[PDB]
Nucleic acid binder design. Structure first.
Ligand code: MG
Length: 569
DNA sequence: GTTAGACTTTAAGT
DNA sequence: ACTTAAAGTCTAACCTATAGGAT
DNA sequence: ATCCTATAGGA
């Protein structure tokens, strides 16, 4: 049919939401109890697809409230009621207490513990069973063991037509072209913080230099050139006249600006973080494309006669649910350039009727969605995140992994290794077998760990592991194969122009440790036949960094236009 | 004010 | 007491070995 | 025969 998705075809802490204890951490000194990190499996309504049910996987930390207990024995007022859940011994079959001090809040104010989605790192079923896909696999198998096929949940696959994969070579070429485009423009870094003792400017310059891009450090920001400012945190300053950010950015209006904190330029291990450099550079490129109203790299072709509208949220107060008409900014492709203007009241009066039923994605609220419109016929196109998560085919991956664990449970006899050495004298795997047999002793068999010097890469190694498999010793196998395709719906650009629906994801090969699910996007329309060039609007690989994108390319350009207006009007 | 996208905790609406 | 949207946190943004097809 | 370029399994 196509890729898998959380949309539903047919319909353990024991409450609303099925918690699966994943991780436990011990508290610091002078405290008792364990912090819990948990995964929730729940069935929820859909906002974007006709109230058809959806699956939801979500981290729900549980902490002890003895952490919050004061020195005098009193307990802090932060949510001191109505939340009582605790664990017993095993991660399932637990209990609570209506006056229990073990709550759903984290250890701190708004700390967000997070859990991986898929883990097949050493293709270990134990590491797999501690990720969201693994928890969902456990959920399905527990439901199956509990009820037979009487109670079953069937994720609705997506009708798939145009599944445009992307390789690491294509994205690598896209970014070498991108940074080649940046080579034409002057780039400046300036550190403006108080008592510049952190030397973050040197680290950022050295990070840029390894992408072969020239940058020069100066004392103060320079007009005309692309600027990077290391300024302190936003809340460090109290007055907007003394904050270097936005005084240097309202002093100069027609100048491209990117700014950074010091702390962001280093990782946990102390080496430079080289991703920050790339994101800064490509974001400056996008802002420059916005600012000169052209394209510095070849974007695809947009649909003809289309217009892209996008609101912006004021810096004002309640109007309770932003009911007051926001400014709305429009973008059009005209010849060799783009036009960005503000949408007048007459245009939006026409639009709110021509868009009609689907007006309320552009108006009435926060997060007002950009929408394409067509002057010629009043047909339009809306791109909305549906809340649907799309999953790699978990049941097959777990079916493979359980058999891998069963195979590695046995120890290979010396007799089989001797037979394999005798019967295949020209294979390259023999030398490692002879060495590991000489290191071993002829009485006891070899466990799997001493095979760790032998990998499932070469063709003779593949033959060796298949030959071990025919004897019942299923040591290693193939899981992330493109030809066999279990880890799709997490890879590459997808497209269904009959229904506009799409998603993005990883590039090239799946990773053993992937921790986010892609989201399916819906293009609501009044069309009978959607324009073909809606394919082209987001076959671009640098909005999301080094990845396929879920939002059309003119929308980000319009948004970086809008954000550039805070210091002009 | 690394960013987009996904994601989780908190706060406002009911 | 429950709901849902708004506010805010946070992690990846791969890497290298092997076979195969082309020249 | 040899060098590049997909395939995907380890760090
Ligand atoms: Mg920004």
């Amino acid at each position: 049919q196509g890729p898998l998705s959380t949309l539903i075809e047919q319909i353990r802490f024991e409450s609303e939401g099925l918690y699966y204890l994943v991780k436990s951490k011990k508290l610091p000194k002078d405290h008792s109890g364990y912090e819990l990190t948990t995964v929730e499996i729940d069935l929820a309504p859909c906002a974007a697809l006709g109230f058809k049910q959806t699956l939801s996987m979500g981290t729900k930390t549980f902490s002890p409230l003895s952490w919050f207990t004061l020195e005098n024995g009193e307990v802090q007022k932060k949510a001191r009621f109505a939340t009582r859940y605790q664990l017993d011994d095993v991660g399932k079959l637990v209990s609570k207490s209506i006056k229990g001090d073990y709550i759903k809040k984290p250890l701190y104010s708004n700390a967000k513990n997070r859990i991986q989605a898929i883990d097949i790192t050493k293709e270990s079923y134990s590491g797999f069973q501690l990720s969201k896909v693994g928890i969902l696999e456990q959920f399905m198998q527990d439901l199956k063991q509990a009820y037979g096929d009487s109670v079953s949940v069937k994720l609705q696959r997506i009708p798939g037509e145009k599944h445009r994969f992307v390789s690491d070579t294509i994205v690598k070429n896209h970014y070498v072209g991108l940074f080649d485009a940046l080579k034409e423009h002057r780039l400046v870094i300036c550190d403006l913080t108080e008592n510049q003792d952190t030397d973050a400017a040197l680290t950022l310059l050295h990070g840029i230099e390894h992408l072969d891009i020239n940058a020069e450090i100066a004392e103060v920001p320079i007009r005309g050139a692309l600027n990077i400012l290391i300024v302190g945190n936003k809340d460090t300053y109290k007055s907007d006249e003394e904050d270097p950010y936005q005084v240097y950015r309202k002093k100069y209006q027609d100048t491209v600006f990117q700014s950074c904190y010091p702390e962001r330029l280093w990782n946990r291990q102390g080496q430079p973080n080289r991703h920050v450099v790339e994101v800064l550079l490509k974001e400056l490129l996008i802002k420059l494309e916005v600012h000169t109203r052209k394209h510095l790299i070849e974007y695809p072709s947009g649909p003809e006669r289309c217009v892209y509208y996008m609101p912006q949220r004021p810096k004002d107060e309640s109007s309770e649910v932003r009911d007051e008409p926001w400014p709305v900014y429009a973008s059009k492709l005209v010849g060799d350039e783009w036009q960005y203007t503000q949408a007048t009241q007459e245009e939006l009066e026409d639009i709110e009727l021509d868009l009609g039923n689907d007006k309320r994605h552009v108006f009435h609220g926060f997060e007002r969605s950009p929408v394409i419109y067509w002057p010629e016929t009043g047909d339009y196109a809306i791109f909305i995140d549906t809340g649907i998560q799309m999953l790699p085919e978990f049941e097959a991956v777990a079916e493979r992994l359980r058999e891998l664990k069963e195979g590695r449970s046995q120890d290979v006899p010396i007799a089989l290794l001797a037979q394999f050495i005798e019967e295949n004298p020209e294979s390259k795997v023999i030398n490692k077998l002879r060495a590991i047999l000489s290191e071993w002793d002829d009485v006891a068999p070899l466990p799997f760990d001493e095979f760790s010097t032998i990998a499932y890469k070469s063709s003779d190694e593949k033959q060796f592991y298949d030959w071990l498999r025919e004897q019942g010793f299923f040591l290693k196998t193939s899981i992330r194969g493109q030809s066999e395709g279990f880890f799709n719906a997490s890879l590459g650009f997808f497209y269904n122009r009959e229904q506009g629906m799409y998603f993005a994801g990883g590039k090239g090969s799946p990773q053993s440790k992937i921790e986010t699910f892609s989201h399916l996007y819906l293009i609501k329309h009044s069309f009978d036949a959607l324009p073909e060039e809606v394919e082209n609007l987001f076959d671009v690989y640098h909005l999301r960094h080094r990845l396929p994108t879920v939002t059309p390319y003119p929308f980000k350009h319009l948004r970086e236009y809008v954000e550039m207006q805070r210091f002009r009007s």
